[PDB]
From a paper:
Human cytosolic prolyl-[name] synthetase (HcProRS) catalyses the formation of the prolyl-tRNAPro, playing an important role in protein synthesis. Inhibition of HcProRS activity has been shown to have potential benefits in the treatment of fibrosis, autoimmune diseases and cancer.
To further clarify the binding mechanism of the identified hits, we determined five co-crystal structures of HcProRS in complex with the corresponding compound and Pro at a resolution range of 2.2–2.7 Å. The EC50 values of 4h (R = 2-Cl) and 4j (R = 2-CF3) proved 6-fold better than R = 2-CH3 in compound 4d, indicating that the electron withdrawing properties might be beneficial for binding. Similar phenomenon was also observed for the 3.6-fold lower EC50 of double substituted compound 3b (R = 2-Cl) when compared with the single substituted 4h. This is evidenced by the 7-fold better binding potency of 2-Cl and 2-CF3 substituted compound 4h and 4j compared with 2-CH3 substituted 4d and 2-fold lower EC50 of 3b (2-Cl) relative to 3c (2-CH3). The similar stabilization of the benzyl ring was also detected for the other studied 2-substituted compounds 4d and 4h.
Numbering used by the authors:
A (entry chain A): 1015 to 1512
B (entry chain B): 1015 to 1463, 1474 to 1512
The structure:
Amino acid sequence: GLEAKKEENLADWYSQVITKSEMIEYHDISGCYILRPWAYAIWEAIKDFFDAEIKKLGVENCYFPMFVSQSALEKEKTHVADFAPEVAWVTRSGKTELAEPIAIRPTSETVMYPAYAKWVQSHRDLPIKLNQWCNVVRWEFKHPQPFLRTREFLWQEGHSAFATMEEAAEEVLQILDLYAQVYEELLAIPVVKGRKTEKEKFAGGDYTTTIEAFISASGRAIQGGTSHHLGQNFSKMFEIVFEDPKIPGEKQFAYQNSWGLTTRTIGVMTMVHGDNMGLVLPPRVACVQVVIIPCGITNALSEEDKEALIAKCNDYRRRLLSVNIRVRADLRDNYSPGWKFNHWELKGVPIRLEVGPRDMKSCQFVAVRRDTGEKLTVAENEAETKLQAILEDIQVTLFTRASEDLKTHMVVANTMEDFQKILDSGKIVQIPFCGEIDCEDWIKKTTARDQDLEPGAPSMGAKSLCIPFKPLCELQPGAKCVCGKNPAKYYTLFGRSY
Amino acid sequence: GLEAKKEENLADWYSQVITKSEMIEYHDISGCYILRPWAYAIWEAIKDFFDAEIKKLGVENCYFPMFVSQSALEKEKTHVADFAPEVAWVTRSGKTELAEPIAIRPTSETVMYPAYAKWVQSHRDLPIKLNQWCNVVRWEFKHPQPFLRTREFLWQEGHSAFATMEEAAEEVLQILDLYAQVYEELLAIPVVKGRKTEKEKFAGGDYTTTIEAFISASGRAIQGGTSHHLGQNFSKMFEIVFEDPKIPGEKQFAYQNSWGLTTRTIGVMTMVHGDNMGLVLPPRVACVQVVIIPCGITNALSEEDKEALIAKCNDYRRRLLSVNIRVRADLRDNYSPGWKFNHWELKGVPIRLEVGPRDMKSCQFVAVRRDTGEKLTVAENEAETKLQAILEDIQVTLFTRASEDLKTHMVVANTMEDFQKILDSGKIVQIPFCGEIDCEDWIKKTTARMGAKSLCIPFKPLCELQPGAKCVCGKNPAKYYTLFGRSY
Ligand SMILES: NC(=O)c1nccnc1NCc1ccccc1Cl
Ligand SMILES: NC(=O)c1nccnc1NCc1ccccc1Cl
Ligand code: PRO
Ligand code: PRO
Ligand SMILES: [Sr+2]
Ligand SMILES: [Sr+2]
Ligand SMILES: [Zn+2]
Ligand SMILES: [Zn+2]
């Protein structure tokens, strides 16, 4: 079973959920974690849905080198400035020192865009739409946490280059909506589409959009994905240039975008839907949607009778495969049935299917929901339609409960004292914000200073999350920021973050 | 158009094929090459086949960290000794030096097996069958060539741990059989299944089974894949143990294998099937099997008739997509039909589908085979039937000629003199060999006066080693017929 309680101490609960579900194994290098097949299948499920959608947009998959030269990495000044201290450098091969240290990619902007310049000579070479699934390394100055914050992580990064800004801006929102579909339709997690502030925006871009998710156990929010508009800052440094047919003889710099989604998605799914019985898989991403377990195999049952009980389970397995239900039949005669119930509950299989000798003679079986523990006795001939209905209802309620949790935890506050008090209750707040960096740092410093949390809870100030595309309330004209010294530009979502 | 010719300068011909087919782009870090969509789509075709086959064997996909500690890397002494010079070491996080350098994986044995030991607590925990599709770094010191020998490459690496030795021995030959299917059933390249010698076997294992392919244009053979039996060399170092089911108090060490296939497959495909017209894709791994191109679009053609020809091309697109044939209609307005002819030829699309106004009105179209250049006028009715037949014809034609090239370039020699003659003729010779590492160093140094190195001990050699035959050196008796030759 599970020892820790998600409501009391969240860290060891998360640590026990990711291990006992066989998702995460630990490594002797801090910030690096093993993705076991149970977690990796979730990533493959996300990969299969996102690949199919970006190919509709004309995006193609490729793979670029992981090593970056010093000169390439420092073409964009403000970009390398933000990533320099967290870049891992290869300095030697074997015992021989490298003449020039090469870098491990924290992101592939400076690796790809030299090639973009070579590939783009005429206007016919645009647009370039490329994506790659790969690993990056970010030796960050933060507490590592599996899935959420790791030194090495798997992701997709898509880099598109266009002749006009209207083409680029269109794709930014197209991709961000795809990231929102990954969270809301696959992981059953609600997200808030928004724009990052000037402080938290991608270094080297004009603006960045993001989806923010909420983790109610810790009251903290987390970034689920970003779609940046790079404008021309990178094409001006890497010389991604073409001649426009309408503007004779003049150098045109391409408009570029980048967008990324990481294996953090798995950790958010764990933090939102996991309970005190272990992991909870949304049926959409569940590696196994239905696990079939033979029950009641006493020593008195004959060898022929036991084989007929196994055959009925395999028959349920074939029936569910013919209707595209991902089903595993745990026929292993080496483990107890209660060990199997516990094993697959920890892993989060949405439905457990129990077949016993009495039920098989009676033309029925038992279906047990993972999210609620509700046990239903279903007729043998209704197995294909009933289970698919339960699988759909599990996905709906997981998103319904997470949405109602989000609606009640994201509110509006206009003054600093109400923003402070609501923040200390475990909520994220939309406040009228002037949109300046020095004020955002002031909020980060004063929310941590005036904090009143539970005994033992560490000091953590609120930071910017996003400027929501559709905020909760309209900003009344002339309304000042929460600092009182500058006019407010927009409602900005704030709160403690991962 | 391609400037170089395969018969003259193979190096410059190869550099121009991979770039003009838009497979490879070059990078300012020596030995690292960009895999563009046309190349990566081949790797995906290899991946979806191979992944489907190992799932039937109970192998599951995962992903282990790229960084390995000094202590974990040096646990197996023979394994770390062979890889030590070619391991890249991270020593700096920005400008702050790590207290201890960490290494980029050249292979993931020392990364995964510490986790294998924690997972194997009893007999119930075996077998463990894990595979990952990832990048790996081996910092070579020889001149790099795209696909064939690169500083960083993509691969899959399977690691399996078994309770018995018969189990691991079964899987080693099962995986090698799948590698043979990848090269023969998909890439249409014949391979020679064999066994590495003591000098060439995987450091840290007991034996290595490999598939060796031959590049006829250069006369040098190349290793297509390997499946190693690690035995207990690693489980005795990383403490992967389990209680003896029969004897209480006695530990048993797991029997392990490892097996890998890299993106070198694409380069071997290029070097074998490519011609002076450019790349030649086998239809089974071809991203685009058929390209539809509208022809005869003159400036005087009526917009109605011009629109009718466009629709006719999309009608073939809908029909071919209905019979699971990968087809793209190149209806782009800013490129001439002749430009698209040479464009898809360079990339290796097996069949070109030409639709002109005269051929459309006569209910016909043209089919151009990439391998032979034959042009076939086909009626609109027998489209899905004949195009499917040509695609399978292209697949068997490419294999039959590469198998015929391998038959006439792999002969048997019996002494040092005649082995040198056939080797410098651009062929690989099977010779009676004593298996010693001493003679393997001598045969490479002598026949260079480059040089032929051990490739594999064929599972099925050409001639049966008659009893009494000694090695080509003369000192020791010959223990088996071995295939030698210059290799990449
Ligand atoms: N070190 C990290 O920030 C991290 N670690 C593990 C997983 N995701 C991480 N980042 C999240 C992220 C990064 C880039 C683009 C989009 C996103 Cl959502
Ligand atoms: N540096 C290289 O040797 C190399 N470079 C690119 C591609 N494959 C490479 N190795 C071949 C290889 C390696 C492991 C297992 C099987 C094989 Cl076939
Ligand atoms: O790292 C980032 O945030 C952007 C998005 C993917 C590519 N680079
Ligand atoms: O490098 C090799 O040859 C073995 C096989 C894959 C993993 N390691
Ligand atoms: Sr920084
Ligand atoms: Sr000019
Ligand atoms: Zn302010
Ligand atoms: Zn000898």
